[PDB]
Design a protein around this ligand. Structure first.
Ligand SMILES: N#CC[C@]1(n2cc(C(N)=O)c(NC(=O)C3CC3)n2)CCN(Cc2ccc(C3=CCCCC3)cc2)C[C@H]1F
Ligand SMILES: N#CC[C@]1(n2cc(C(N)=O)c(NC(=O)C3CC3)n2)CCN(Cc2ccc(C3=CCCCC3)cc2)C[C@H]1F
Lengths: 286, 281
């Protein structure tokens, strides 16, 4: 038997974990013994809908996650074929967005800096394999335990071609624009330095314990004036050009805010790296 | 009796003409004799904004020009703007239906009449911000009139521009790049919109070669959130609407001078008037 092969007849759906880009992540139990004793797994699959090659993109995402092995990347477990499904480990603590509001008392600055280092190690591993992530946000950072996080979704991940610095996207609809670097918004070009910008925003979230009233979206929309959505993105672009950035989170020491600010240099070439952030956080943790 | 006060009791509804920015323009007969003999008028009102309608009323009341739709008065209880009725409607409805009658010479005379109406508005220090074929009314085969001023704004003396930015329903496919990027409106922003409107007139307002259709073919039906950035980016690359079918190159060149990226580089309405008059000799 192939232990990465999950038979559909044994994969009993429990409930939805997430919805997004014409598909869903569901909690299922794999129960070949039929007694509710099998392992819980997270299952990604497309709605019957599909089209503008949603299938070829999921199949690419499967092949991406299958060959990633890092302690800060969610584990591939296998596939279910029929409309293919990606099977992953289930992390019952969910994302930082679920976990941090409930665990403020147990998660102090030292733990938040450790989680920051673990996200950066994950992201630097993905960069080392020539991938741009394009969706780095607290909602995609999963909690393994109070001491460990893992990057938990790869649905926008693209390979940068060898001898090229960026990937140009066509398919655009559902962009998380409040996490996107200016080159992504203005020119739909994604560099590794674009993942750093997003990392800066995800650190802001981590340091505000993912409070909905302090989310990047809620703070950017307070900043930017009367506007349509059609006009939202262009007003956001104009604010970033003038040099406005998310404010320092409450209780956030200025030395951590300075690391975050280096993520948000307007020009990709001027931004800090992931290895540089890891160094700066470890220095704070000594 | 004030001949600009219209009594609500004698304003008989016939039908709707259009809808926009949280209200409508209806056809009514003002019929104080109650025998169906009263004049037809166009009436702009809000559903149950008020302050902006009052400003629009005060702008139009004080504009007098052969190529600007005639203010007739108000109905007060709430307020309604009463305008002259032009039964031939907008260029968007008229051109498709009258291609046999309207040749290039007549299209160039409509172009001059729009430019004269627009340069009059400019000299009163207004920026229109909504110049499109759907807002140019046909008086007759030989005469057009700018027919709606609902987005019109004053430019402050010794300022070059007005910043909106009550922004949400912009006609983006007619907007200059300063309007898209910074929400800034100059007299030169109206020259860019005129360029798009001359494109519509020269294609006899065909839906399939509207500025919107043509720009979306060019950038893709992408997202709308991202639609406007992608449009900004395409105008930066230097791409413009193509030459309409059958449109001579020297007309197209005057059109292209409306679409210089920098406002300070765009043609004036006076230069457009003279360039066309030169073509009609
Ligand atoms: N990372 C992350 C967040 C998601 N997630 C994964 C898990 C997990 N493995 O335990 C999880 N656990 C919980 O919540 C626990 C119960 C609290 N949550 C995955 C992505 N989804 C959004 C999503 C959904 C669908 C798609 C698709 C895109 C294209 C292909 C088809 C599907 C992409 C992203 C949210 C959480 F489920
Ligand atoms: N210009 C122009 C186009 C409109 N129009 C005016 C006339 C007219 N005077 O004879 C007219 N004739 C016809 O159609 C004939 C029958 C073919 N058509 C006016 C604007 N409307 C959109 C519109 C509607 C409502 C609003 C409001 C904004 C806020 C205040 C309340 C209403 C703005 C623009 C389309 C045609 F009626």
């Amino acid at each position: 038997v192939d232990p990465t092969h999950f038979e559909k007849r044994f994969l009993k759906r429990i409930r939805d974990l997430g919805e997004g880009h014409f598909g869903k992540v569901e909690l299922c139990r794999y129960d070949p013994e039929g007694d509710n004793t099998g392992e819980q797994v997270a299952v990604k699959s497309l709605k019957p809908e599909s089209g503008g090659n949603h299938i070829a993109d999921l199949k690419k995402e499967i092949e991406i996650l299958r060959n990633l092995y890092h302690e800060n990347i969610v584990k591939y477990k296998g596939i279910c074929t029929e409309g293919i499904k990606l099977i992953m480990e289930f992390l019952p603590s969910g994302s930082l967005k679920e976990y941090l509001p409930k665990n403020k008392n147990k998660i102090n600055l030292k733990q938040q800096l450790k989680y920051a280092v673990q996200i950066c190690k994950g992201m630097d591993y993905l960069g080392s394999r020539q991938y741009v992530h394009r969706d780095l946000a607290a909602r995609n950072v999963l909690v393994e335990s109070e001491h460990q996080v893992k990057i938990g979704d790869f649905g926008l991940t693209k390979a940068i071609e060898t001898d090229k610095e960026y990937y140009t996207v066509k398919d655009d609809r559902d962009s998380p624009v409040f996490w996107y670097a200016p080159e992504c918004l203005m020119q739909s070009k994604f560099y590794i330095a674009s993942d750093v910008w997003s990392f800066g925003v995800t650190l802001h979230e981590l340091l505000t314990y993912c409070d909905s009233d302090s989310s990047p979206m809620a703070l950017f929309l307070k900043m930017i004036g009367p506007t349509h959505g059609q006009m939202t993105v262009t007003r956001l672009v104009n604010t970033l050009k003038e040099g406005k950035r998310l404010p320092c989170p409450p209780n956030c020491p200025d030395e951590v805010y300075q690391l975050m600010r280096k993520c948000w240099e307007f020009q990709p070439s001027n931004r800090t790296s992931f290895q540089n952030l890891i160094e700066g956080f470890e220095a704070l943790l000594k």
